[PDB]
Ligand binder design. Structure first.
Ligand code: KSG
Ligand code: K
Ligand code: K
Ligand code: K
Ligand code: K
Ligand code: K
Ligand code: K
Ligand code: MG
Ligand code: MG
Ligand code: MG
Ligand code: MG
Ligand code: MG
Ligand code: MG
Ligand code: MG
Ligand code: MG
Ligand code: MG
Ligand code: MG
Ligand code: MG
Ligand code: MG
Ligand code: MG
Lengths: 100, 102, 88, 117, 52, 65
RNA sequence: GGGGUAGAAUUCCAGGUGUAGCGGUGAAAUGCGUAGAGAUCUGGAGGAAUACCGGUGGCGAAGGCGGCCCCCUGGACGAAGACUGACGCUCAGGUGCGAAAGCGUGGGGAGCAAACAGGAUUAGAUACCCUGGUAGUCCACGCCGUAAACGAUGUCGACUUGGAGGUUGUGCCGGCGUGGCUUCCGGAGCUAACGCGUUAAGUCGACCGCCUGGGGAGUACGGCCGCAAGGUUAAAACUCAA
RNA sequence: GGUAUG
């Protein structure tokens, strides 16, 4: 329904990111879901500390999808303790253009 | 250093303050009772009780009507207070009976 | 609210056209669908008082449309209340 | 002692008092001095001047640590905000950083009732 | 107005991080509200500071 | 407010900066109004009064010109 | 409506540093602190509330509603059409919603705080002020049904000069229109006056509610409702000449 | 700091 999943990763487990991406984006396409964007910004400085950490690894997934898969992605992000913080927004349309 | 507890041990016995209740010659019964309940409360806490009776104008010319009131209070507070002073005369326009706890 | 598809189904089924959105049958049908759907909502969300006021306006608006049709044309009325499964 | 050299001057400037604690950069306390400890009593504590004196007595309690640079962390609405800082400069310590660190509660907790005075 | 467009958002916050009034920046009311939501999403992702 | 003292600038100048920094951020004004509870009716009352006064300026700073 | 989540702050807990005060007031004292407080730093626990944005801004029938995110969901407005064909307006009784306090059962409990305890002030001070502090404030479910629940202004429709704004659509070429909501001023008119004034308190029409001197009294009695607190309906004698 | 009472 045009989501926009950002998620930040514990910068140690930046190793795990390209694998974790696939595992999620596979479950999207598993139920008909587009991936209109995927922009790994990579390691960045947090503007404030989050559970000790002063940097973290950001990823941006603009995703058309059903609702059930987005719910499953939230449970994954919750338990996957490498993921420090996630935000699933909604968007009106799909966004393919590049973001800073 | 340990003056803190010495100061407390001093203060844990209270200084007797003097509470003032003021009557008039024509103080009515219910209002008298309120003032008496005040005095009872004061004396049971161990405070002295400067009971005053203020005359006004020509009420001066009927001193004994005032004196009656002070006598009444003494009698009512008999098994509780002791008269440290009773007024002989009207000093100014007042008559000050100091009571004190037994 | 009903989806554009769910609407356009009901309009086709009860209309005399796909232009025929105005018909009392369509209007009552549309209202009956959305009324029925919301029975789910208010079983879960029993304290959603503000939403329930919207529901009662649908119930009320339906009752009025049915009473209009009952006196305008009783044949159309009897069919409609069986098709939609309405008591009165 | 360990010649701290660079330390931190936390000025708790309340409406009634002015605490002045000098700490190291890790926020371990070296020496402290309140306006209420500086002779002033009652609402003479709550003066700019009593803050000035409190700073000076704190300065002279961290003589042994031989501090030279200070970070000033003022906290609160008190009269002894600027007065404390001016004193620390004149006391010889060079001021690298002055920061307001007054708490604002981003809403939080219900304050006490207004005084009907 | 984009929560990710930190360069644009930085024009509408103060040094301390607080959102600037539209009376100051002369922004239109519709955009001030979009801008406010943007700034608040940024802050959650730690792309802008809440404070300091 | 993070007035770090710059190179070759006097203390008194840096303290004026710290004041203007705090006076604009409005830290002391904030602490004052959070000292005691103001119930919402009182908050709204003051907000309306401020608005009427601000309005009464605009129809008297002009309305005269 | 539901669920999640974030940062700030307060309290507490555990440490580190540190040492004699802190706190409070008009002034004090109660209190806290050498069993090491307050201050400062680190970490943890927990509850409640969302700074700035924020606006005579917005939304809602009213009560009311303010971090962010999702889920479920109601209403409003505009643009062109297309469709139904008076299907409308109002509404006694009825039904529901309804701030806060309060009540029941069970959770929770940071902060705040009726009661209460103490310290003061005082002629007294059952207060205001200070230190504390329980119910409560929060959650769930159930009750209660009242507020200056106010625009002190019932709902719907039509008509009747203007000015300055705000907010939210939209058409056309920053300008020129055209809708919705809204703040302020003012014309005619209205009004006892104050004022209201196209969002009317103007000019009219439909329907409903309500008033008939003050006090007695929103009380008594009765009924209905309520676990209770009470609520609702609602008099009279009498007395006054306002 | 409470301006009890001509
Ligand atoms: C300050 C006092 O103010 C009020 O009493 C006033 C009285 O003290 C005299 O000044 C005059 O008779 C005034 O006309 C009265 O209004 C009255 N509210 C009681 C107050 N006093 C106290 N609370 C107190 O003394 O204590
Ligand atoms: K997580
Ligand atoms: K009817
Ligand atoms: K409590
Ligand atoms: K007149
Ligand atoms: K009468
Ligand atoms: K009754
Ligand atoms: Mg509205
Ligand atoms: Mg909506
Ligand atoms: Mg309540
Ligand atoms: Mg309860
Ligand atoms: Mg308290
Ligand atoms: Mg209190
Ligand atoms: Mg009423
Ligand atoms: Mg109002
Ligand atoms: Mg009324
Ligand atoms: Mg109606
Ligand atoms: Mg007007
Ligand atoms: Mg009238
Ligand atoms: Mg009654």
């Amino acid at each position: 329904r045009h989501y926009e999943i950002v998620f930040m990763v514990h910068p140690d487990q930046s190793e795990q990111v390209p694998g974790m991406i696939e595992r999620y984006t596979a479950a999207i396409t598993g139920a008909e879901g587009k991936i209109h964007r995927l922009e790994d910004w990579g390691r960045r400085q947090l503007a404030y500390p989050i559970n000790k950490l002063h940097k973290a690894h950001y990823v941006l997934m603009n995703v058309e999808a059903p609702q059930e898969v987005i719910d499953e992605l939230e449970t994954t992000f919750r338990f996957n303790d490498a993921v420090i913080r996630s935000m699933v927004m909604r968007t009106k349309h799909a966004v393919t253009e590049a973001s800073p | 250093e340990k003056s803190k507890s010495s100061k407390e041990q001093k203060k844990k016995q209270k200084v007797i303050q003097v509470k003032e209740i003021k009557f008039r010659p024509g103080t009515d019964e219910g209002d008298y009772q309120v003032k008496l309940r005040s005095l009872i409360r004061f004396l049971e806490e161990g405070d002295k009780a400067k009971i005053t009776l203020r005359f006004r104008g020509r009420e001066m010319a009927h001193q004994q009507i005032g004196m009656e009131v002070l006598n009444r209070v003494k009698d009512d507070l008999q098994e509780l207070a002791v008269v440290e002073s009773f007024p002989t005369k009207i000093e100014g326009r007042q008559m000050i009976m100091v009571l004190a706890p037994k | 609210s009903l989806s554009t598809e769910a609407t356009a189904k009901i309009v086709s089924e009860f209309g005399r056209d796909a232009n025929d959105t105005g018909s009392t049958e369509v209007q009552v049908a549309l209202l009956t669908a959305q009324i029925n759907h919301l029975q789910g909502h208010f079983a879960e969300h029993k304290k959603d008082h503000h939403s329930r006021r919207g529901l009662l306006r649908m119930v009320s608006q339906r009752r009025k449309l049915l009473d209009y049709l009952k006196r305008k044309d009783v044949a159309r009325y009897t069919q409609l209340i069986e098709r939609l499964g309405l008591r009165r | 002692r360990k010649q701290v050299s660079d330390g931190v001057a936390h000025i708790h400037a309340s409406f009634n008092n002015t605490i002045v604690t000098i700490t190291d950069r890790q926020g371990n306390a070296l020496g402290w001095a309140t306006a209420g400890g500086s002779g002033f009593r009652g609402s003479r504590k709550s003066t700019p001047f009593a803050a000035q004196v409190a700073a000076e007595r704190c300065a002279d309690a961290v003589k042994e640590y031989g501090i030279k640079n200070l970070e000033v962390m003022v906290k609160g609405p008190g009269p002894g905000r600027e007065s404390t800082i001016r004193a620390l400069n004149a006391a010889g310590f060079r001021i690298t950083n002055i920061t307001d660190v007054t708490p604002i509660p981003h809403x939080g907790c219900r304050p006490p009732k207004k005084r009907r005075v | 107005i984009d929560y990710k467009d930190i360069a644009t958002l930085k024009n509408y916050i103060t040094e301390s991080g607080k959102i600037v009034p539209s009376r100051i920046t002369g922004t239109r009311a519709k955009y001030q509200r979009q801008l406010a939501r943007a700034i608040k999403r940024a802050r959650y992702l730690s792309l802008l500071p809440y404070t300091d | 407010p993070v007035i770090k003292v710059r190179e070759n600038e006097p203390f008194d100048v840096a303290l004026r900066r710290f004041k203007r920094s705090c006076e604009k951020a409005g830290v002391l004004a904030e602490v004052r109004r959070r000292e005691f509870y103001e119930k919402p009716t009182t908050e709204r009352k003051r907000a309306k009064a401020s608005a009427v006064k601000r309005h009464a300026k605009k129809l008297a700073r002009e309305n005269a010109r």
